[PDB]
Design a binder for this molecule. Structure first.
Ligand SMILES: *[C@@H]1O[C@H](CO)[C@@H](O)[C@H](O)[C@H]1NC(C)=O
Ligand SMILES: *[C@@H]1O[C@H](CO)[C@@H](O)[C@H](O)[C@H]1NC(C)=O
Ligand SMILES: *[C@@H]1O[C@H](CO)[C@@H](O)[C@H](O)[C@H]1NC(C)=O
Ligand SMILES: *[C@@H]1O[C@H](CO)[C@@H](O)[C@H](O)[C@H]1NC(C)=O
Ligand SMILES: *[C@@H]1O[C@H](CO)[C@@H](O)[C@H](O)[C@H]1NC(C)=O
Ligand SMILES: *[C@@H]1O[C@H](CO)[C@@H](O)[C@H](O)[C@H]1NC(C)=O
Ligand SMILES: *[C@@H]1O[C@H](CO)[C@@H](O)[C@H](O)[C@H]1NC(C)=O
Lengths: 129, 48, 88, 171, 48
């Protein structure tokens, strides 16, 4: 009965939805689950997302631009050695640092590990032309 | 969430006021103590 | 009290564990995954000529994450894996 | 049960030789190499707190498959993966990340911006260290802190003692 | 075994990740958790 309650919970939270519980439905970031009837039991085919190929990058908590601290709206600041990019956490998709993906939260004196870089303003080129 | 918090007096159940029955129960060991301990554990568990 | 049961093989097979002593299995100083749990961290397996080997089971492949207050590791590729889970 | 609880990790991760975690101090929870068994001070208190031993009536106690040292090695691997990688070591390859950035991740997890932590990094680190020290002190002082494990041990010992004493009755 | 299943679930959802379940791992907005070996048990240091 405990096993069947667990099976019902897994059906509800992984077949009927996507569960954020870690290692509840498969090892990895759970995507789906498919029930399969079995003799006196049930089999779940837990479809999970597993990152594969890592790559080292230099990172900073914030970006000091124009005398103010810029933090990533969603992602992390990474550098390939010379240029700084903002990248989503779970997949390497470098993006140019702009004001759309970053938010200002003060000055640079207080953040530990902040680095000096430029933040592109998507309004200045239109203002010039 | 919980169930009825019953308790059973093993000596009073097996035997009434009888003392010969009480002695014959005494020679059977500590079964009554185990039963009372289990029921008390159930009671405390219901409160918990 | 018959010699067929008592076999020691010069005493090399005799191995003293914490769960007792294992007789008839050769001790190996390297580690694999647990196959037959003897107890107290000792597991036995049938591996090559071929004989029962008693060993301290390996908890896993030792790893050392290259921690640094400045470096991060971001995956550039993924893997859609399907795991099978069986429940009565 | 032991193998399900403690063997979640697949590889025994190692804590880096230098502890530069932006002010966070895991010395109370990380293994102490000076003492013989690589157990953290908190683990030392936990093992010291929980406490007719030669029963010859057919009763024997089988040793657990996972020794206390192996369970401590699992615990150390989990701690090192959590400190160095975060949650990434349970969902695939362990991805290194500075601990202040991992805490920024977790703050976003609870619905608080990274902003809150990056200007309160020292304050949050000090609060975490003080909380860990208070756990150390409370475990050291209060004798009934580990009530559940001691209760389990006492229940098993009392059951065995009753089983032994049942041989004295005539039936 | 029920306690050990709960311990395994807490390990998976709090040591290996951040759980949004309320009061599952500590009182408050859960941040982390640290396993600690104990005699016949486990101790979790729920950072909240
Ligand atoms: C990152 O650098 C460390 C430095 O020792 C190295 O061990 C590791 O393999 C590197 N990661 C990648 C993906 O190359
Ligand atoms: C980093 O990426 C930029 C992309 O704009 C490229 O121009 C530069 O050569 C790259 N540098 C390295 C070291 O990969
Ligand atoms: C990282 O730590 C080193 C010393 O361990 C220090 O010199 C450096 O400034 C630190 N960087 C950041 C971003 O904290
Ligand atoms: C960033 O630039 C400012 C002036 O633009 C300077 O005062 C500061 O020292 C720089 N930061 C670093 C880390 O060089
Ligand atoms: C362990 O066994 C190997 C077998 O080749 C041997 O070479 C080594 O000396 C042994 N070490 C100890 C400490 O017994
Ligand atoms: C990702 O991995 C797949 C195989 O798993 C491969 O076919 C593909 O080329 C890889 N992509 C990159 C960008 O490495
Ligand atoms: C961490 O705590 C230990 C004892 O609790 C103390 O000796 C040490 O100075 C603290 N800081 C570091 C960086 O180890």
């Amino acid at each position: 009965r405990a096993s069947a309650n667990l099976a019902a919970t897994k059906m509800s939270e992984c077949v009927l939805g996507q569960s954020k519980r870690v290692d509840f439905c498969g090892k990895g970031y759970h995507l789906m689950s498919f029930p399969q009837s079995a003799p006196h039991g049930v089999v779940f085919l837990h479809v999970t997302y597993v990152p594969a190929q890592e790559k080292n990058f230099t990172t900073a908590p914030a970006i000091c631009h124009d005398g103010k601290a810029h933090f990533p709206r969603e992602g992390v600041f990474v550098s390939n050695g010379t240029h700084w990019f903002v990248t989503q956490r779970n997949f390497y998709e470098p993006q140019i640092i702009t004001t759309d993906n970053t938010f200002v939260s003060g000055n640079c004196d207080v953040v530990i590990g902040i680095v000096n870089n430029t933040v592109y303003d998507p309004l200045q080129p239109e203002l010039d032309s | 969430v919980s169930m009825t918090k019953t308790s059973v007096d093993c000596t009073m159940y097996i035997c009434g006021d009888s003392t010969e029955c009480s002695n014959l129960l005494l020679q059977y060991g500590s079964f009554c103590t185990q039963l009372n301990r289990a029921l008390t554990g159930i009671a405390v568990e219901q409160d918990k | 009290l018959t010699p067929t049961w008592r076999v020691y093989s010069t005493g090399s097979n005799v191995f003293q564990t914490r769960a007792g002593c294992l007789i008839g299995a050769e001790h190996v100083n390297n580690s694999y995954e647990c196959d037959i749990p003897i107890g107290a961290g000792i597991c036995a397996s049938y591996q090559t000529s071929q004989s029962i080997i008693a060993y301290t089971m390996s908890l896993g492949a030792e790893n050392s994450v290259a921690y640094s207050n400045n470096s991060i590791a971001i995956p550039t590729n993924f893997t859609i894996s399907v795991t099978t889970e069986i429940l009565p | 049960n032991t193998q399900e609880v403690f063997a979640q990790v697949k590889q025994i991760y190692k804590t880096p030789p230098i502890k530069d975690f932006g002010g966070f101090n895991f010395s109370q929870i990380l293994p102490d190499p000076s003492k013989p068994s690589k157990r953290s001070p908190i683990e030392d208190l936990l093992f010291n707190k929980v406490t007719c031993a030669q029963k010859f009536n057919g009763l024997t106690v089988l040793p657990p498959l996972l020794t206390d040292e192996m369970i401590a090695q699992y615990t150390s691997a989990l701690l090192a993966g959590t400190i160095t990688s975060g949650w990434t070591f349970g969902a695939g390859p362990a991805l290194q990340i500075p601990f202040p950035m991992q805490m920024a991740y977790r703050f976003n997890g609870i619905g608080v911006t990274q902003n809150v932590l990056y200007e309160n990094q020292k304050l949050i680190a000090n609060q975490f260290n003080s909380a860990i020290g208070k756990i150390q002190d409370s475990l050291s002082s209060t004798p009934s802190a580990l009530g559940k494990l001691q209760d389990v041990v006492n229940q098993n010992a009392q059951a065995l003692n009753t089983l032994v004493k049942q041989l004295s009755s005539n039936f």
